[PDB]
Amino acid sequence: SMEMDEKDFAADSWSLAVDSSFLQQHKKEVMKQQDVIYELIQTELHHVRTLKIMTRLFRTGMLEELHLEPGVVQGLFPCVDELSDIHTRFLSQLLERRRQALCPGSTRNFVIHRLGDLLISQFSGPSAEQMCKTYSEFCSRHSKALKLYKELYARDKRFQQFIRKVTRPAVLKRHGVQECILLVTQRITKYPLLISRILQHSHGIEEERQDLTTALGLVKELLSNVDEGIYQLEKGARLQEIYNR
């Protein structure tokens, strides 16, 4: 992540990110809603950072330093460029909504009142179709990526040394290859929990309550479609094993 966004989301909550004199101006219900919206954006920033570790540190590092057989790097990191484009675009929209909401003279005091419309846009139309297509492909290739990683780590000296080198820094403690893959697979199922809690504190404006109710329904339809479109791929599985599913 870039320093400006890391500092804007360094605090454990929106109530600790804004100036205390600005916090004092809002009612408790507004503070509760803003704290959950801040968690959705903060966790989206971290999810985009996970995808940048996968594309820049791991994938690009393996292409530039190791002599792997063709198709091996794509097998370890399926769909990572498409996932990076989807979420960097979504994060850009969330951060622009926050930036427009800033008070003049401040880089930290804001209230986002209209998130629902942004979530409906993300989770409908062509962007929802692309999220469904990409996650159905990624999640169906998840077992295969983990197995290929385990094989290379145990049999290839140079691969093991590369992984130990780039994952040595303390800032990579939670972000080994297999950990990144599961953080990405689990991201999509965090959205309903976050949206439902924002909705619980968004009754003050009826149009906002209706828009977040619509967004929650669209996210659950996307998740149901991805879940029904998954079938784990296995290297070396024969056609007979497949058509006898």
Binding site: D12, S15, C139, K173, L183, T185, T189, L193
Partner: protein, 179 residues
């Protein structure tokens, strides 16, 4: 420091997310309790052995039967949670969660954990449950369920007061280290 993986399972109301949050911060959040848990790698020393224990939550995956099992590969220990204020969460352990964990995590130790033990003697909880002809889970009901499902052991904790939380994760680490 050897690396081990822990996964927590249980119904949406079992308190699994709060349990991981409180353990990972050694604190019940004073200002904001997070809605979700990403992951964490805890440095734990148990009985003289140093382990890096990776922690994962299954919250949000309960309705998605093809996404949920992607959390299980290479798990070394399972915490299977229920809430003591919810006999309904305990009823879903033996024939829903247990056969799933035994299928995807064969031979992995399961610790059955009764969460929210601070509510066993809470007047409001006892009043609400009595309307559905129910009462908080008794410790013998928890132990008998753990015995029935082939659990490695039975433990209780309260994420609210932190009591029992450290003990659950130190025991999970010991279970993960066993042959």
């Amino acid at each position: 420091a050897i690396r081990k993986k822990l996964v927590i399972v249980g119904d949406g109301a079992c308190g699994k997310t709060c349990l991981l949050i409180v353990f990972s911060k050694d604190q019940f959040p004073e200002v904001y309790v997070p809605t979700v848990f990403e992951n964490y790698v805890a440095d734990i020393e148990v009985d003289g052995k140093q382990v890096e224990l990776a922690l994962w939550d299954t919250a949000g995956q309960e309705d998605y039967d093809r996404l949920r099992p992607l959390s299980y590969p290479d798990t070394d220990v399972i915490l299977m949670c229920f809430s003591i204020d919810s006999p309904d969460s305990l009823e879903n352990i033996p024939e829903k969660w247990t056969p799933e964990v035994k299928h995807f995590c064969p031979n992995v130790p399961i610790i059955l954990v009764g969460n929210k033990k601070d509510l066993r003697n809470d007047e409001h909880t006892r009043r609400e449950l009595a309307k559905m002809k129910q009462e908080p889970v008794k410790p013998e009901e928890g132990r008998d369920m753990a015995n029935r499902i082939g659990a490695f052991g039975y433990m209780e904790c309260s994420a609210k007061t932190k009591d029992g939380v450290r003990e659950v994760f130190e025991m999970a680490t010991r279970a993960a280290l066993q042959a």
